[PDB]
Amino acid sequence: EISPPPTANLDRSNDKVYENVTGLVKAVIEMSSKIQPAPPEEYVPMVKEVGLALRTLLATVDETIPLLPASTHREIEMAQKLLNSDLGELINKMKLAQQYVMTSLQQEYKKQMLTAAHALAVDAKNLLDVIDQARLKMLGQTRPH
């Protein structure tokens, strides 16, 4: 089943064979994890990644809000509160999907978790447009008349 790591006694820094074996193995792993439905064990790590990506976006949007017209703030802040909403729901649906594994509700909680996820990405794209309109507005202001 199992074998030792590849020999440490070869350079690897210009080893195209090593690199191509790596590429092909990854291409197989990527293919297989697409084809197959991930087990609910795997949900948590997947969600932590999404959550990390959110906090980065939010912390960045925090630092951008000082620049933008005061009249744009409430709307940006709402767009953020909405992403947090999507995260709440994502997390709750995840927990429900895990709890109801091997019930008649497995597929439904799964679907609903994905709906929460898809919503989080639509609303991210929406936060971008909100911030962008804010910025163009500020450029209008900054530009003399």
C-alpha positions as protocol buffer text, in pm:
chain_id: "A"
residue {
  index: 1
  type: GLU
  ca { x: 0 y: 0 z: 0 }
}
residue {
  index: 2
  type: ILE
  ca { x: 267 y: 245 z: 123 }
}
residue {
  index: 3
  type: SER
  ca { x: 631 y: 339 z: 34 }
}
residue {
  index: 4
  type: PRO
  ca { x: 916 y: 570 z: 161 }
}
residue {
  index: 5
  type: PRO
  ca { x: 951 y: 935 z: 33 }
}
residue {
  index: 6
  type: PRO
  ca { x: 1158 y: 974 z: -293 }
}
residue {
  index: 7
  type: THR
  ca { x: 1539 y: 963 z: -256 }
}
residue {
  index: 8
  type: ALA
  ca { x: 1694 y: 1269 z: -84 }
}
residue {
  index: 9
  type: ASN
  ca { x: 2024 y: 1198 z: -272 }
}
residue {
  index: 10
  type: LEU
  ca { x: 1925 y: 1371 z: -599 }
}
residue {
  index: 11
  type: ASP
  ca { x: 1905 y: 1750 z: -656 }
}
residue {
  index: 12
  type: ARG
  ca { x: 1541 y: 1806 z: -770 }
}
residue {
  index: 13
  type: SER
  ca { x: 1605 y: 2176 z: -834 }
}
residue {
  index: 14
  type: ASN
  ca { x: 1615 y: 2117 z: -1215 }
}
residue {
  index: 15
  type: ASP
  ca { x: 1445 y: 1774 z: -1216 }
}
residue {
  index: 16
  type: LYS
  ca { x: 1167 y: 1792 z: -1482 }
}
residue {
  index: 17
  type: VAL
  ca { x: 1078 y: 1426 z: -1429 }
}
residue {
  index: 18
  type: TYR
  ca { x: 1004 y: 1498 z: -1061 }
}
residue {
  index: 19
  type: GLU
  ca { x: 811 y: 1809 z: -1162 }
}
residue {
  index: 20
  type: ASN
  ca { x: 606 y: 1625 z: -1428 }
}
residue {
  index: 21
  type: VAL
  ca { x: 524 y: 1334 z: -1196 }
}
residue {
  index: 22
  type: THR
  ca { x: 402 y: 1603 z: -952 }
}
residue {
  index: 23
  type: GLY
  ca { x: 190 y: 1771 z: -1220 }
}
residue {
  index: 24
  type: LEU
  ca { x: 28 y: 1445 z: -1335 }
}
residue {
  index: 25
  type: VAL
  ca { x: -45 y: 1330 z: -974 }
}
residue {
  index: 26
  type: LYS
  ca { x: -209 y: 1668 z: -897 }
}
residue {
  index: 27
  type: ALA
  ca { x: -407 y: 1653 z: -1224 }
}
residue {
  index: 28
  type: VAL
  ca { x: -536 y: 1311 z: -1111 }
}
residue {
  index: 29
  type: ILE
  ca { x: -616 y: 1436 z: -758 }
}
residue {
  index: 30
  type: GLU
  ca { x: -796 y: 1742 z: -898 }
}
residue {
  index: 31
  type: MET
  ca { x: -993 y: 1523 z: -1139 }
}
residue {
  index: 32
  type: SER
  ca { x: -1087 y: 1274 z: -870 }
}
residue {
  index: 33
  type: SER
  ca { x: -1200 y: 1532 z: -613 }
}
residue {
  index: 34
  type: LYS
  ca { x: -1420 y: 1696 z: -881 }
}
residue {
  index: 35
  type: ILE
  ca { x: -1589 y: 1364 z: -997 }
}
residue {
  index: 36
  type: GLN
  ca { x: -1657 y: 1252 z: -636 }
}
residue {
  index: 37
  type: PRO
  ca { x: -1877 y: 1414 z: -367 }
}
residue {
  index: 38
  type: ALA
  ca { x: -1663 y: 1511 z: -65 }
}
residue {
  index: 39
  type: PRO
  ca { x: -1748 y: 1340 z: 272 }
}
residue {
  index: 40
  type: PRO
  ca { x: -1902 y: 1569 z: 543 }
}
residue {
  index: 41
  type: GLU
  ca { x: -1584 y: 1525 z: 744 }
}
residue {
  index: 42
  type: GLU
  ca { x: -1429 y: 1746 z: 474 }
}
residue {
  index: 43
  type: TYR
  ca { x: -1688 y: 2023 z: 506 }
}
residue {
  index: 44
  type: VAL
  ca { x: -1520 y: 2201 z: 799 }
}
residue {
  index: 45
  type: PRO
  ca { x: -1175 y: 2258 z: 635 }
}
residue {
  index: 46
  type: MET
  ca { x: -1351 y: 2374 z: 316 }
}
residue {
  index: 47
  type: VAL
  ca { x: -1564 y: 2622 z: 515 }
}
residue {
  index: 48
  type: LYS
  ca { x: -1267 y: 2748 z: 721 }
}
residue {
  index: 49
  type: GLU
  ca { x: -1099 y: 2840 z: 391 }
}
residue {
  index: 50
  type: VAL
  ca { x: -1407 y: 3032 z: 272 }
}
residue {
  index: 51
  type: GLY
  ca { x: -1420 y: 3207 z: 613 }
}
residue {
  index: 52
  type: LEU
  ca { x: -1053 y: 3307 z: 601 }
}
residue {
  index: 53
  type: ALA
  ca { x: -1115 y: 3454 z: 250 }
}
residue {
  index: 54
  type: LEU
  ca { x: -1410 y: 3651 z: 396 }
}
residue {
  index: 55
  type: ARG
  ca { x: -1218 y: 3801 z: 691 }
}
residue {
  index: 56
  type: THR
  ca { x: -944 y: 3911 z: 455 }
}
residue {
  index: 57
  type: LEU
  ca { x: -1202 y: 4076 z: 229 }
}
residue {
  index: 58
  type: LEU
  ca { x: -1374 y: 4239 z: 531 }
}
residue {
  index: 59
  type: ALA
  ca { x: -1052 y: 4368 z: 695 }
}
residue {
  index: 60
  type: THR
  ca { x: -956 y: 4509 z: 352 }
}
residue {
  index: 61
  type: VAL
  ca { x: -1296 y: 4673 z: 310 }
}
residue {
  index: 62
  type: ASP
  ca { x: -1257 y: 4817 z: 663 }
}
residue {
  index: 63
  type: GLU
  ca { x: -938 y: 4994 z: 553 }
}
residue {
  index: 64
  type: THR
  ca { x: -1096 y: 5119 z: 229 }
}
residue {
  index: 65
  type: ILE
  ca { x: -1403 y: 5283 z: 391 }
}
residue {
  index: 66
  type: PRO
  ca { x: -1205 y: 5580 z: 541 }
}
residue {
  index: 67
  type: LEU
  ca { x: -1114 y: 5687 z: 181 }
}
residue {
  index: 68
  type: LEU
  ca { x: -1466 y: 5685 z: 36 }
}
residue {
  index: 69
  type: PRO
  ca { x: -1742 y: 5956 z: 51 }
}
residue {
  index: 70
  type: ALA
  ca { x: -1914 y: 5948 z: 394 }
}
residue {
  index: 71
  type: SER
  ca { x: -2243 y: 5909 z: 202 }
}
residue {
  index: 72
  type: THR
  ca { x: -2128 y: 5563 z: 75 }
}
residue {
  index: 73
  type: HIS
  ca { x: -2055 y: 5408 z: 421 }
}
residue {
  index: 74
  type: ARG
  ca { x: -2398 y: 5280 z: 535 }
}
residue {
  index: 75
  type: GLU
  ca { x: -2435 y: 5094 z: 203 }
}
residue {
  index: 76
  type: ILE
  ca { x: -2087 y: 4941 z: 208 }
}
residue {
  index: 77
  type: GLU
  ca { x: -2142 y: 4843 z: 573 }
}
residue {
  index: 78
  type: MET
  ca { x: -2474 y: 4680 z: 481 }
}
residue {
  index: 79
  type: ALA
  ca { x: -2302 y: 4486 z: 200 }
}
residue {
  index: 80
  type: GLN
  ca { x: -2054 y: 4357 z: 460 }
}
residue {
  index: 81
  type: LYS
  ca { x: -2328 y: 4268 z: 711 }
}
residue {
  index: 82
  type: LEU
  ca { x: -2488 y: 4068 z: 428 }
}
residue {
  index: 83
  type: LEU
  ca { x: -2168 y: 3863 z: 367 }
}
residue {
  index: 84
  type: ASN
  ca { x: -2163 y: 3792 z: 745 }
}
residue {
  index: 85
  type: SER
  ca { x: -2525 y: 3683 z: 710 }
}
residue {
  index: 86
  type: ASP
  ca { x: -2426 y: 3444 z: 430 }
}
residue {
  index: 87
  type: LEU
  ca { x: -2147 y: 3311 z: 651 }
}
residue {
  index: 88
  type: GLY
  ca { x: -2383 y: 3248 z: 945 }
}
residue {
  index: 89
  type: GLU
  ca { x: -2614 y: 3056 z: 710 }
}
residue {
  index: 90
  type: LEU
  ca { x: -2333 y: 2865 z: 538 }
}
residue {
  index: 91
  type: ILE
  ca { x: -2201 y: 2755 z: 883 }
}
residue {
  index: 92
  type: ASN
  ca { x: -2547 y: 2657 z: 1011 }
}
residue {
  index: 93
  type: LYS
  ca { x: -2631 y: 2462 z: 696 }
}
residue {
  index: 94
  type: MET
  ca { x: -2290 y: 2290 z: 717 }
}
residue {
  index: 95
  type: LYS
  ca { x: -2361 y: 2183 z: 1077 }
}
residue {
  index: 96
  type: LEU
  ca { x: -2706 y: 2065 z: 972 }
}
residue {
  index: 97
  type: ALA
  ca { x: -2561 y: 1876 z: 667 }
}
residue {
  index: 98
  type: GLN
  ca { x: -2320 y: 1696 z: 904 }
}
residue {
  index: 99
  type: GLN
  ca { x: -2587 y: 1622 z: 1168 }
}
residue {
  index: 100
  type: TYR
  ca { x: -2832 y: 1479 z: 911 }
}
residue {
  index: 101
  type: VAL
  ca { x: -2577 y: 1264 z: 721 }
}
residue {
  index: 102
  type: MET
  ca { x: -2734 y: 921 z: 658 }
}
residue {
  index: 103
  type: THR
  ca { x: -3086 y: 1059 z: 708 }
}
residue {
  index: 104
  type: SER
  ca { x: -3336 y: 1155 z: 435 }
}
residue {
  index: 105
  type: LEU
  ca { x: -3216 y: 1517 z: 487 }
}
residue {
  index: 106
  type: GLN
  ca { x: -2851 y: 1461 z: 383 }
}
residue {
  index: 107
  type: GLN
  ca { x: -2895 y: 1578 z: 24 }
}
residue {
  index: 108
  type: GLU
  ca { x: -3118 y: 1874 z: 124 }
}
residue {
  index: 109
  type: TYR
  ca { x: -2886 y: 2026 z: 387 }
}
residue {
  index: 110
  type: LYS
  ca { x: -2596 y: 1970 z: 146 }
}
residue {
  index: 111
  type: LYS
  ca { x: -2783 y: 2160 z: -131 }
}
residue {
  index: 112
  type: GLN
  ca { x: -2877 y: 2436 z: 115 }
}
residue {
  index: 113
  type: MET
  ca { x: -2517 y: 2472 z: 231 }
}
residue {
  index: 114
  type: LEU
  ca { x: -2412 y: 2515 z: -138 }
}
residue {
  index: 115
  type: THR
  ca { x: -2688 y: 2772 z: -178 }
}
residue {
  index: 116
  type: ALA
  ca { x: -2548 y: 2964 z: 121 }
}
residue {
  index: 117
  type: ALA
  ca { x: -2199 y: 2936 z: -40 }
}
residue {
  index: 118
  type: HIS
  ca { x: -2314 y: 3052 z: -386 }
}
residue {
  index: 119
  type: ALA
  ca { x: -2495 y: 3344 z: -218 }
}
residue {
  index: 120
  type: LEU
  ca { x: -2173 y: 3442 z: -35 }
}
residue {
  index: 121
  type: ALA
  ca { x: -1991 y: 3469 z: -375 }
}
residue {
  index: 122
  type: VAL
  ca { x: -2271 y: 3661 z: -550 }
}
residue {
  index: 123
  type: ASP
  ca { x: -2277 y: 3907 z: -251 }
}
residue {
  index: 124
  type: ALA
  ca { x: -1896 y: 3939 z: -264 }
}
residue {
  index: 125
  type: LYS
  ca { x: -1927 y: 4045 z: -629 }
}
residue {
  index: 126
  type: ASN
  ca { x: -2197 y: 4286 z: -511 }
}
residue {
  index: 127
  type: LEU
  ca { x: -1972 y: 4433 z: -241 }
}
residue {
  index: 128
  type: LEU
  ca { x: -1716 y: 4495 z: -519 }
}
residue {
  index: 129
  type: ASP
  ca { x: -1965 y: 4692 z: -731 }
}
residue {
  index: 130
  type: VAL
  ca { x: -2075 y: 4891 z: -419 }
}
residue {
  index: 131
  type: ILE
  ca { x: -1713 y: 4979 z: -335 }
}
residue {
  index: 132
  type: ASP
  ca { x: -1646 y: 5057 z: -707 }
}
residue {
  index: 133
  type: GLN
  ca { x: -1940 y: 5299 z: -737 }
}
residue {
  index: 134
  type: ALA
  ca { x: -1814 y: 5457 z: -411 }
}
residue {
  index: 135
  type: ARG
  ca { x: -1467 y: 5504 z: -570 }
}
residue {
  index: 136
  type: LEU
  ca { x: -1591 y: 5649 z: -900 }
}
residue {
  index: 137
  type: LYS
  ca { x: -1811 y: 5887 z: -695 }
}
residue {
  index: 138
  type: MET
  ca { x: -1503 y: 5995 z: -494 }
}
residue {
  index: 139
  type: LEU
  ca { x: -1307 y: 6048 z: -818 }
}
residue {
  index: 140
  type: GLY
  ca { x: -1589 y: 6275 z: -939 }
}
residue {
  index: 141
  type: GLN
  ca { x: -1556 y: 6469 z: -611 }
}
residue {
  index: 142
  type: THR
  ca { x: -1173 y: 6480 z: -617 }
}
residue {
  index: 143
  type: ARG
  ca { x: -1163 y: 6588 z: -985 }
}
residue {
  index: 144
  type: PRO
  ca { x: -1209 y: 6972 z: -1003 }
}
residue {
  index: 145
  type: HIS
  ca { x: -1503 y: 7131 z: -1193 }
}
